[PDB]
């Protein structure tokens, strides 16, 4: 089956350079035009560049013209996107896409895309998370159910993994997607709904792991007297 | 520059419903139009090419029509796997996309369970106070959350995060976090989060007076 | 060199 796999994304400082890679299998790469497309909340899906089968003809979006350069090594079945003078508006998921096959048509789109690679332009430094308890209380109870959790604040970069009771607790858990604070750091929250009757005889521990900083925190969530 | 606009932007439909998505181009693109489907965390997948031609493996319940400036994508009977975001794309002059149409699963109204979490003593010692309001397993998605401090509303320093629609019960959950310094935290007493939603007969307020916890 | 024409080998 036709398959494309992007690589090279990550966190990068503004004004620096970064080269992305797209690896093709399941078709004759040397005979197809190839595309780069990017997706961000701010600008939606936005085409970036196209390169002809032989690596000759290349066309670019105005947003990236003069800063980005597309290339390909047909011997390595690899498509490349060199990004220079990177700025914050270039933060997006970058997809690579195969041109539609030759037909009698005069205009050509694209059929198969790759999974995508994430490019984050930021000045932040790698920081471990501060895990704060979201304590159960009279104000976090509904019926016979009580909510409790762990606030994972001020970490960078993504991602953070959160488990409960070393993975033995798998029901009632909602770990929320991270939000980017104005500080440039990330903060998320993991919450679990449990029977209120168990808070005295059951220990609830959240296990937060941020691999970039090798921070592994096991916080026991104890109820507040309120 | 050819600009593609889609309608609706968001649609709530039940399984087995017939859904029609419309795409309009700023100028005539003849039939050089393509429809893509995108699920969260996944790449876009081509469904229809050149306005009407179904791609290989795409179920026949998908169909596309139109020429020139007006185009439509039709799903005759929605399947659980069809709930995703759909993009149109013109390929006559470069490649531009519509803003996307999100098709979400319609289920019975479920009121949210509201919980409020006061800042920890550990964080308050660090000069930062984060208050968390939790809304759990509700539908529809559009629950509204406001932070009232001494019955006065707050603006800025309030971020919301919402989960994807749950695969098991098609509910949503939402957290709103109010981050304020200890200095501003000590300035006032009553901290509250008021929730409004169709599942609730009246607004729900969870509150705590500073120093009570 | 038109962007939307056939970008493939044949």
Author numbering:
A (entry chain H): 1 to 52, 52A, 53 to 82, 82A, 82B, 82C, 83 to 100, 100A, ...
B (entry chain L): 1 to 94, 96 to 214
C (entry chain P): 2 to 11
Give passages from the manuscript.
As the most abundant surface protein expressed by Pf sporozoites and with essential roles in parasite development and invasion, Pf circumsporozoite protein (PfCSP) is a major target for biomedical interventions.
The 10 mAbs that exhibited high affinity for the major repeat and varying degrees of cross-reactivity induced two distinct conformations in the antigen. Comparison of the 1210- and MGG4-like binding modes revealed that the N-core conformation was largely dictated by the HCDR3. All seven 1210-like mAbs contained a bulky Lys or Tyr residue six positions from the end of the HCDR3 (termed here position HCDR3(-6)) that directly occluded the MGG4-like conformation through steric hindrance. The presence of an HCDR3(-6) Lys/Tyr appeared to correlate with IGHJ gene usage because all seven 1210-like mAbs were encoded by IGHJ6∗02, where Tyr is the GL-encoded HCDR3(-6) residue40. For five of the seven 1210-like mAbs (Ky15.2, Ky15.3, Ky15.5, Ky15.7, and Ky15.8), this position was occupied by a Lys residue that formed a salt bridge with the Asp at the beginning of the N-core when DPNA was bound in this site. Overall, the 1210-like recognition mode resulted in significantly greater total BSA than the MGG4-like configuration among the crystallized Fab-peptide complexes examined here. Between seven 1210-like mAbs and three MGG4-like mAbs, we observed that the 1210-like mAbs exhibited significantly greater inhibition of parasite liver burden than the MGG4-like mAbs.
